[PDB]
């Protein structure tokens, strides 16, 4: 439930005798955790809110100019000086002008001309700082079992902040899922500013919100603003000798939009900013999970397919059954079988133990299950009233292993070293791989990783040729980098 149709879900199975499993949660998909004798739980990261951000250095992308003025001097006098150069609200530019004996000053050298124009910025952008504290994640989890396909004992919501990283989700009758999580190290919110232009908010990397050539204030907006650049958005174009002219460049809001690329959008509610693209790593201490249904007597009245058979994107099969004759809280017999002569259970039933909880007249329940690759029958019911459905699965285990390796490669390309923590009950091989991946990742991000799609495809083709025809012992080295680089393109 709640991860059936996500199409980016992965199954985390097994544990150290029921102690705990490490799991990384992502905004895109969700994780269904299934244990030996514990109810399958679907866990998803929903929203990340950032709170009380602090304004830093707001820019101007639309200038407006005002009453120009100018002053000229004797070809041989000092330099022009307007009294409006002693005002930090004017842009002033000094140049040389052809002058003399026609304009009014007897001499013929170049003069000196100063032009000043008042500056006013309309609707300038603002970035704000994000501390890795006061940052909240909201995790939604649900349980399989009795919920039909459509205070409720089966779903929980957990708020996790650096000030309280550990929480227990109390699922009534199922016990409680303990959940220890790491909120700080999630997405490295120590280089990302929150940027607004006009009701559109982005996540922006520092070193891109400091190398912007636009008039910038700094922090406290108190009275008549003071813009530091003062020259970029105003163009002092000058005709030789005769004229000086001041124009403003226009509105800049489209040049920023294209400068933003690879920056994440966000949306803001009140003083808080919700990001919908994130990354979180929680350890799941599932040793207080119980099975509600056991000790029930299995239901023997009849079962009817209501929704018949549905296949998810990953191979599993969802079934929605309706139970006719009221027994009570009562167990559902269900299995995958081939050779209906001898009902030998095959495949795996990924739902804990389906149980109907209602006792009114007719009840609805949804289970799902992981059938074998060949043809098979979904068999539901006890005897002489067993409904069977015929189900066919596509691909042999080899294709499954290949798709698993592809998923692992994509998860690594997205997460870095953190990917080694997805199914990380934790050994020594896993830890060693994580360490060497940390080292190689630091090296790679320090050498490359100032490049974009096209740039790295170029340098990848280049080093492919190089490693191909170098003929020394470094060839492999070259070749290795190329996989990395190229893999980073063909996974976006």
């Amino acid at each position, epitope marked *: 439930i709640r991860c059936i149709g996500v199409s980016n879900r992965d199954f985390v199975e097994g544990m150290s005798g029921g102690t705990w499993v490490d799991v990384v949660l992502e905004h895109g998909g969700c994780v269904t955790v299934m244990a030996q004798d514990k109810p399958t739980v679907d866990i998803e990261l929903v929203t990340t809110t950032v709170s009380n951000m602090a304004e830093v250095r707001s820019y101007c992308y639309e200038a407006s100019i005002s009453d120009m003025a100018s002053d000229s001097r004797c070809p041989t006098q000092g330099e022009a000086y307007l009294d409006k150069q002693s005002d930090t609200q004017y842009v002033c530019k000094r140049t040389l002008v052809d002058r003399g004996w026609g304009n009014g000053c007897g001499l013929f050298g170049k003069g000196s001309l100063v032009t000043c124009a008042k500056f006013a910025c309309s609707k300038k952008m603002t970035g704000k700082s994000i501390q890795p504290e006061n940052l909240e994640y909201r995790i939604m989890l649900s349980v399989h079992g009795s919920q*039909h*396909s*459509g205070t409720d004992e089966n779903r929980a919501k957990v708020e996790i902040t650096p000030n309280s990283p550990r929480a227990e989700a109390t699922l009534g009758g199922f016990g409680s899922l303990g959940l220890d999580c790491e909120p700080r190290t999630g997405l490295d919110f120590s280089d990302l500013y929150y940027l607004t232009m006009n009701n559109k908010h982005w996540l922006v990397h520092k070193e891109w919100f400091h190398d912007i050539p636009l008039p910038w204030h700094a922090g406290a907006d108190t009275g008549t603003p003071h813009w530091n650049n003062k020259e970029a958005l105003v163009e002092f174009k000058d005709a030789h000798a005769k004229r000086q002219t001041v124009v403003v460049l226009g509105s800049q809001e489209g040049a920023v939009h294209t400068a933003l690329a690879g920056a994440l959008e966000a949306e803001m509610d009140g003083a808080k900013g919700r990001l919908s693209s994130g990354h979180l790593k929680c350890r799941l201490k599932m040793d207080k999970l119980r099975l509600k249904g056991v000790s029930y007597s299995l239901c023997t009245a009849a079962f009817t397919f*209501t*929704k018949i058979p549905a296949e998810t994107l990953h191979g599993t099969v969802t079934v*929605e059954v309706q139970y006719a004759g009221t027994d009570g809280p009562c167990k559902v017999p269900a299995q995958m079988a081939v050779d209906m002569q001898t009902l030998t259970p095959v495949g795996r039933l990924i739902t804990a133990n389906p149980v109907i909880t209602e006792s*009114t*007249e*007719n009840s*609805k329940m949804m289970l799902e299950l992981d059938p074998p690759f060949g043809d098979s029958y979904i068999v539901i019911g006890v005897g002489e009233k067993k409904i069977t459905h015929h189900w066919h699965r596509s691909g042999s285990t080899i294709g499954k292993a290949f798709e698993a390796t592809v998923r692992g490669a994509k998860r690594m390309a997205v997460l870095g070293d953190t990917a080694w923590d997805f199914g990380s009950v934790g050994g020594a091989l896993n830890s060693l791989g994580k360490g060497i991946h940390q080292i190689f990742g630091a090296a790679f991000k320090s050498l490359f990783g100032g490049m974009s799609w096209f740039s790295q495809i170029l340098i990848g083709t280049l080093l492919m040729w190089l490693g191909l025809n170098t003929k020394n012992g470094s060839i492999s080295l070259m070749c290795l980098a190329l996989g990395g680089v190229l893999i980073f393109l063909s996974t976006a």
Partner: antibody
Amino acid sequence: VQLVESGGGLVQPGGSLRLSCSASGFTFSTYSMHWVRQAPGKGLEYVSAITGEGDSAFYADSVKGRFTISRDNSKNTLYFEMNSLRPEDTAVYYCVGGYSNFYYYYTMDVWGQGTTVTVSS
Amino acid sequence: SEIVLTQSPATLSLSPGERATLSCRASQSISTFLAWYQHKPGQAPRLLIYDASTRATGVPARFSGSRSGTDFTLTISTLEPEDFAVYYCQQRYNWPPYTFGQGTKVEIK
């Protein structure tokens, strides 16, 4: 959890009108809103809808072009600005709301009391 | 074109306590997304059943819903006096175009 409708009254053919629907008791932004009208001695007619976030809007062919649905999640108010009214629009309008996680889909809904809109003749 | 729902009985006349059966047929396949509403004069329409067999919150157990292909059925075992009203079926399929059946009136014969 309640929806209070208002703005109904008498109008001339070709005239205009604006109906409002104030929501209470729930997170308005998570609810897709719908307008359903019933002519006198006629069955219910699903005429308009808007998503929870206001992104997209849907109009039935019978009203497509003349009526405009909108919503303000800060004031928790749904609006059905109906222009170019015809005598065929004389009916009781209900605003309904349902918790939506997808563009317009909902399972359990909540209805208002309805408001009568009568064209003069 | 648009899906249409056809309710068979235009008006139904029954004595109190009698069994009541109403049928709604769709013009095309809809898996289980059918709703049943009860509407009384001078009142807002009341949701009775969603997903064609699931009773809404607080609806008494006497109302039941069933499906067979494209034919949906609303059944009232023990008719009570407060149950005589108009009953509509509404389509909850993929996109917002939703059609209410023409309705069936349950009358006290």
